[PDB]
A = this chain, B = another copy of it.
Amino acid sequence: RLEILDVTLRDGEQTRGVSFSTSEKLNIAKFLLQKLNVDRVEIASARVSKGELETVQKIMEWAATEQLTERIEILGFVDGNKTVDWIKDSGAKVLNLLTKGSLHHLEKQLGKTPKEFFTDVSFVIEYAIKSGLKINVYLEDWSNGFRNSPDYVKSLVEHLSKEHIERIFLPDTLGVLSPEETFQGVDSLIQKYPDIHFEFHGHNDYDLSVANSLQAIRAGVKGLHASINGLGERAGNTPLEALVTTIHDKSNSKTNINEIAITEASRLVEVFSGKRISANRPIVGEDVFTQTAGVNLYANPILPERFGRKR
């Protein structure tokens, strides 16, 4: 009853020193969709470069072969026709539009009016639909936007509700929210728009992302974003492995993820990305199942074979 969007290949790629080859991205994409069973994957950003375009084409060639094309998503921008054209040629059929979720960002980067910007947005969604694509919209910096420019944010959502988009994404872009705050901002929107599919997208700057994610689930979110090993730009995104385990054991909601493929997904991403995880990394670290001082008295609901390890 909860969709899971993995942004490991995109948001996770932005990380310093990390860059996946076409072979690695295809390998990871196949695993997450077929083995780990994550609902969808965000494999790239449009207009990044050629090669990245080729990469998306191969994955779409494959994804088509497997009736999964609708499960791949591309991060795009409000640039008129450039993003949609790029995604059009890539082979991908889904665009996750990046819009300004804070009045502060809109003015300091674009220097536009909520009216002007909404027109630019409507064009892109308009042109995207016209081009056979589906659209999800990111309210970038929403975490700061609903706390400082709550009006701009309400009109932006008000505008997107009159548009034909699949989902609206509420990201803690700078990862500055506490769980109480995440609940407020999300509850605020879900209660005004009970018919829109919202998904929370947290970042782990204060090591609160999965806790925040839980509160978002309380507020009424229908999906969550996460990356393997919490790969991402700063402290990374919400760590997929701990989020799912936490959703399964500490919430009445469910997920379609196969807990058993969790250890391999991690090893895969760790090797290919080249970013080592600590031995104590929750659920997925090397020594996380080892209790040397504990002298089934100290049995934890977190067992090695539950995640495809030690058996």
Contact = CB atoms under 8 A, between A and B. Distances in A.
Interface of A: 14-17, 105, 108-109, 173-176, 178-179, 204-208, 210-211, 214, 229-236, 239, 242, 245-246, 249-250, 275-283, 285, 287-294, 297-302
A300 B178 contact: no
A246 B108 contact: no
B301 A176 contact: yes
Contacts of A287: 15-17, 234
B300 A176 contact: yes
A230 B180 CA distance: 24
Contacts of A242: 206-207
A114 B28 CA distance: 54
Contacts of A290: 16, 233-234
B294 A233 contact: yes
Given A174-B300, A175-B300, A293-B233, A206 B250 contact: yes
Given A174-B300, A234-B289, 8 more contacts: A16-B290, A109-B297, A176-B301, A204-B282, A206-B210, A206-B249, A206-B282, A235-B282
Given A15-B287, A234-B287, A205 B300 contact: yes
A101 to B, nearest CB: 13
Given A178-B250, A291-B233, A297-B108, A302 B205 contact: yes
A211 B179 contact: yes
27 contacts: A14-B292, A15-B287, A15-B292, A17-B287, A109-B297, A174-B299, A175-B300, A176-B301, A178-B250, A179-B179, A179-B214, A205-B283, A205-B288, A205-B300, A206-B249, A206-B250, A206-B283, A207-B242, A207-B282, A208-B246, A211-B211, A235-B281, A235-B283, A235-B288, A276-B276, A276-B278, A276-B279
